[PDB]
Amino acid sequence: KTHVQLSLPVLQVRDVLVRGFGDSVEEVLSEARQHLKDGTCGLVEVEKGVLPQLEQPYVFIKRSDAAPHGHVMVELVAELEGIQYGRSGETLGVLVPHVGEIPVAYRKVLLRK
């Protein structure tokens, strides 16, 4: 399927144990996609002071369209030293590995895979 319905656990930035997916734009997009498939991906909502507490490169989910079955259609965009790889809509948050942190909420997305 070109799209997959996921429910992503929303984590508080200070709870996150593994603060990024790796060391290159290509690796973080690769790892983010693998963790999304394996159900081991969390979402941190971006506000003042969040991104400096996480590791670059960043992987964002961004709104790809204006929401089947409650699921917002999203795609992945990476960012390293102020350059983004991908072009999409509004940021829903930054992806991180989920290693058992307790979420505050769930974000239903339809991921362009």
Swiss-Prot record:
Domain annotation CoV Nsp1 globular: ranges: 2-113
Region named Disordered: 1-113
Superkingdom of origin: Viruses
Subcellular location: Host cytoplasm
Physiological role: Inhibits host translation by associating with the open head conformation of the 40S subunit. The C-terminus binds to and obstructs ribosomal mRNA entry tunnel. Thereby inhibits antiviral response triggered by innate immunity or interferons. The nsp1-40S ribosome complex further induces an endonucleolytic cleavage near the 5'UTR of host mRNAs, targeting them for degradation. This inhibits the integrated stress response (ISR) in the infected cell by preventing EIF2S1/eIF2-alpha phosphorylation upstream of stress granule formation and depletes host G3BP1.
Protein name according to UniProt: Host translation inhibitor nsp1
Protein species of origin: Severe acute respiratory syndrome coronavirus 2 (2019-nCoV)
Residues of the full protein shown: 11 to 125 of 7096
